[PDB]
mmCIF file of C-alpha atoms and ligand atoms in Angstrom:
data_model
loop_
_atom_site.group_PDB
_atom_site.id
_atom_site.type_symbol
_atom_site.label_atom_id
_atom_site.label_comp_id
_atom_site.label_asym_id
_atom_site.label_seq_id
_atom_site.Cartn_x
_atom_site.Cartn_y
_atom_site.Cartn_z
ATOM 1 C CA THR A 1 237.620 185.874 -55.251
ATOM 2 C CA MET A 2 241.339 185.755 -56.231
ATOM 3 C CA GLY A 3 240.963 185.282 -60.007
ATOM 4 C CA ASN A 4 241.380 182.486 -62.567
ATOM 5 C CA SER A 5 245.078 183.356 -63.283
ATOM 6 C CA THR A 6 245.960 183.214 -59.529
ATOM 7 C CA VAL A 7 244.162 179.861 -58.901
ATOM 8 C CA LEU A 8 245.609 178.272 -62.098
ATOM 9 C CA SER A 9 249.184 179.504 -61.354
ATOM 10 C CA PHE A 10 248.893 178.180 -57.744
ATOM 11 C CA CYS A 11 247.718 174.722 -59.037
ATOM 12 C CA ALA A 12 250.101 174.604 -62.085
ATOM 13 C CA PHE A 13 253.324 174.663 -59.950
ATOM 14 C CA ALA A 14 251.975 172.290 -57.219
ATOM 15 C CA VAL A 15 253.570 168.812 -57.417
ATOM 16 C CA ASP A 16 249.900 167.533 -57.653
ATOM 17 C CA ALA A 17 247.858 170.144 -59.609
ATOM 18 C CA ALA A 18 244.595 168.099 -59.269
ATOM 19 C CA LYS A 19 244.956 167.791 -55.457
ATOM 20 C CA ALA A 20 245.719 171.561 -55.236
ATOM 21 C CA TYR A 21 242.470 172.469 -57.105
ATOM 22 C CA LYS A 22 240.335 169.915 -55.159
ATOM 23 C CA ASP A 23 241.771 171.205 -51.805
ATOM 24 C CA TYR A 24 241.065 174.819 -52.942
ATOM 25 C CA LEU A 25 237.416 173.846 -53.799
ATOM 26 C CA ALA A 26 236.962 171.962 -50.455
ATOM 27 C CA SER A 27 238.152 175.187 -48.623
ATOM 28 C CA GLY A 28 235.235 177.150 -50.260
ATOM 29 C CA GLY A 29 237.295 178.536 -53.178
ATOM 30 C CA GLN A 30 235.382 180.105 -56.114
ATOM 31 C CA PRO A 31 235.531 177.727 -59.114
ATOM 32 C CA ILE A 32 237.586 178.498 -62.244
ATOM 33 C CA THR A 33 235.416 180.488 -64.717
ATOM 34 C CA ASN A 34 235.716 181.500 -68.414
ATOM 35 C CA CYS A 35 235.036 177.922 -69.620
ATOM 36 C CA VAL A 36 233.569 177.988 -73.192
ATOM 37 C CA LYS A 37 229.795 177.269 -72.901
ATOM 38 C CA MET A 38 228.187 175.964 -76.149
ATOM 39 C CA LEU A 39 224.826 176.987 -77.667
ATOM 40 C CA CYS A 40 222.860 173.683 -78.117
ATOM 41 C CA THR A 41 219.282 172.267 -78.290
ATOM 42 C CA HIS A 42 219.777 169.987 -75.194
ATOM 43 C CA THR A 43 218.367 167.084 -77.362
ATOM 44 C CA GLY A 44 221.721 165.234 -77.639
ATOM 45 C CA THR A 45 222.865 161.707 -76.605
ATOM 46 C CA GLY A 46 224.021 162.929 -73.129
ATOM 47 C CA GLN A 47 227.379 161.094 -73.605
ATOM 48 C CA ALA A 48 230.171 162.663 -71.466
ATOM 49 C CA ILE A 49 232.794 163.560 -74.177
ATOM 50 C CA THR A 50 231.780 163.968 -77.858
ATOM 51 C CA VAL A 51 232.912 165.225 -81.329
ATOM 52 C CA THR A 52 230.055 167.862 -81.273
ATOM 53 C CA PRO A 53 227.890 169.173 -78.368
ATOM 54 C CA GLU A 54 225.536 166.399 -77.059
ATOM 55 C CA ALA A 55 223.951 167.924 -73.880
ATOM 56 C CA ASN A 56 220.562 166.315 -72.972
ATOM 57 C CA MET A 57 217.969 168.296 -70.891
ATOM 58 C CA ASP A 58 219.992 167.646 -67.633
ATOM 59 C CA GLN A 59 223.385 168.913 -68.988
ATOM 60 C CA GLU A 60 225.346 171.880 -70.381
ATOM 61 C CA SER A 61 227.954 171.448 -73.196
ATOM 62 C CA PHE A 62 231.420 173.134 -73.015
ATOM 63 C CA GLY A 63 234.579 173.230 -75.131
ATOM 64 C CA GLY A 64 236.705 170.353 -73.749
ATOM 65 C CA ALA A 65 240.104 172.111 -73.371
ATOM 66 C CA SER A 66 238.462 175.053 -71.455
ATOM 67 C CA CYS A 67 237.209 172.495 -68.804
ATOM 68 C CA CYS A 68 240.559 170.596 -68.466
ATOM 69 C CA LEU A 69 242.772 171.622 -65.469
ATOM 70 C CA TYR A 70 245.970 170.433 -67.329
ATOM 71 C CA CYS A 71 245.091 172.405 -70.521
ATOM 72 C CA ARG A 72 244.131 175.516 -68.433
ATOM 73 C CA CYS A 73 247.373 175.191 -66.329
ATOM 74 C CA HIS A 74 249.511 174.621 -69.543
ATOM 75 C CA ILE A 75 251.084 171.480 -67.921
ATOM 76 C CA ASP A 76 251.620 167.838 -69.017
ATOM 77 C CA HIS A 77 248.588 165.496 -68.671
ATOM 78 C CA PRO A 78 248.926 162.692 -66.073
ATOM 79 C CA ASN A 79 249.408 159.682 -68.453
ATOM 80 C CA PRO A 80 252.495 158.181 -70.208
ATOM 81 C CA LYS A 81 251.798 159.730 -73.701
ATOM 82 C CA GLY A 82 250.386 162.963 -72.095
ATOM 83 C CA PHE A 83 247.191 162.627 -74.248
ATOM 84 C CA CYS A 84 244.132 164.830 -73.398
ATOM 85 C CA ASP A 85 240.645 163.170 -73.614
ATOM 86 C CA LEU A 86 238.962 166.673 -73.631
ATOM 87 C CA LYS A 87 241.038 168.841 -76.068
ATOM 88 C CA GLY A 88 239.257 169.297 -79.466
ATOM 89 C CA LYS A 89 236.095 167.612 -78.036
ATOM 90 C CA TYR A 90 232.916 168.826 -76.215
ATOM 91 C CA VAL A 91 232.186 167.839 -72.598
ATOM 92 C CA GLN A 92 228.638 167.426 -71.200
ATOM 93 C CA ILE A 93 228.360 168.570 -67.525
ATOM 94 C CA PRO A 94 225.282 167.926 -65.316
ATOM 95 C CA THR A 95 223.424 171.292 -64.940
ATOM 96 C CA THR A 96 223.721 170.816 -61.099
ATOM 97 C CA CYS A 97 227.606 170.846 -61.467
ATOM 98 C CA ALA A 98 227.986 173.306 -64.452
ATOM 99 C CA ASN A 99 229.169 176.124 -62.084
ATOM 100 C CA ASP A 100 232.520 174.174 -61.904
ATOM 101 C CA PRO A 101 233.216 172.227 -65.132
ATOM 102 C CA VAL A 102 237.009 171.937 -64.364
ATOM 103 C CA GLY A 103 236.290 170.429 -60.900
ATOM 104 C CA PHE A 104 233.602 168.136 -62.353
ATOM 105 C CA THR A 105 235.862 166.638 -65.107
ATOM 106 C CA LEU A 106 238.764 166.287 -62.592
ATOM 107 C CA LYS A 107 236.629 164.410 -59.989
ATOM 108 C CA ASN A 108 234.559 162.145 -62.317
ATOM 109 C CA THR A 109 234.980 159.123 -64.674
ATOM 110 C CA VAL A 110 233.174 158.064 -67.923
ATOM 111 C CA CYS A 111 231.232 154.691 -67.876
ATOM 112 C CA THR A 112 233.149 152.575 -70.496
ATOM 113 C CA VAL A 113 229.717 150.921 -71.303
ATOM 114 C CA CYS A 114 227.147 153.772 -71.859
ATOM 115 C CA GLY A 115 229.809 156.564 -72.290
ATOM 116 C CA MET A 116 228.051 158.761 -69.638
ATOM 117 C CA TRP A 117 229.510 160.060 -66.293
ATOM 118 C CA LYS A 118 229.535 157.351 -63.542
ATOM 119 C CA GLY A 119 227.162 158.433 -60.708
ATOM 120 C CA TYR A 120 225.280 160.994 -62.905
ATOM 121 C CA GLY A 121 224.051 160.271 -66.491
ATOM 122 C CA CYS A 122 225.064 156.556 -66.182
ATOM 123 C CA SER A 123 222.086 154.306 -65.137
ATOM 124 C CA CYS A 124 223.881 150.933 -65.864
HETATM 125 C C1 LIG B 1 248.539 185.263 -53.606
HETATM 126 C C2 LIG B 1 248.686 185.659 -54.916
HETATM 127 C C3 LIG B 1 249.267 184.809 -55.841
HETATM 128 C C4 LIG B 1 249.716 183.544 -55.464
HETATM 129 C C5 LIG B 1 250.326 182.640 -56.447
HETATM 130 C C6 LIG B 1 250.317 182.651 -57.810
HETATM 131 N N1 LIG B 1 251.034 181.585 -58.296
HETATM 132 C C7 LIG B 1 251.465 180.937 -57.242
HETATM 133 N N2 LIG B 1 251.055 181.526 -56.104
HETATM 134 C C8 LIG B 1 249.566 183.165 -54.133
HETATM 135 C C9 LIG B 1 248.976 184.019 -53.216
HETATM 136 C C1 LIG B 2 219.803 178.064 -71.748
HETATM 137 C C2 LIG B 2 218.683 177.344 -72.107
HETATM 138 C C3 LIG B 2 218.468 176.078 -71.584
HETATM 139 C C4 LIG B 2 219.379 175.514 -70.690
HETATM 140 C C5 LIG B 2 219.153 174.170 -70.146
HETATM 141 C C6 LIG B 2 218.126 173.288 -70.328
HETATM 142 N N1 LIG B 2 218.367 172.151 -69.600
HETATM 143 C C7 LIG B 2 219.521 172.343 -68.994
HETATM 144 N N2 LIG B 2 220.029 173.544 -69.293
HETATM 145 C C8 LIG B 2 220.505 176.256 -70.338
HETATM 146 C C9 LIG B 2 220.711 177.523 -70.866
HETATM 147 CL CL1 LIG B 3 240.804 184.355 -67.507
HETATM 148 CL CL1 LIG B 4 225.866 163.088 -66.944
HETATM 149 ZN ZN1 LIG B 5 243.681 168.788 -71.320
HETATM 150 ZN ZN1 LIG B 6 226.963 153.391 -67.714
#
């Protein structure tokens, strides 16, 4: 275990920060920790990204910015306006993936229909 600061610094200065973290995880690297876990009833909508925590019984809720590689690396977000979908919001992570919220949000996409993670919560 090399530490959050070491992993984030290594990814932050890579030309592709997302690829750097994914390659690190694929090599057996310990996931980034110290994400902000929320106290909640697990009775929520189960939508992926929300104004308040919305974990259902299959999810954990976290502070959005703490689970965002770009926020955690202090670098620009990969879109023209550099907007963050996670900052100031709460992200619902499947309990099976909640050991690596940064990796989960990086690798996954929200169903534009039901607002749940494609391949997980989404049953469209
Ligand atoms: C060992 C220790 C630190 C690092 C590093 C930190 N930021 C970039 N590389 C790389 C290997
Ligand atoms: C503490 C209490 C309950 C839970 C939980 C319930 N369903 C998923 N996680 C997680 C932490
Ligand atoms: Cl830390
Ligand atoms: Cl989900
Ligand atoms: Zn962000
Ligand atoms: Zn869906």
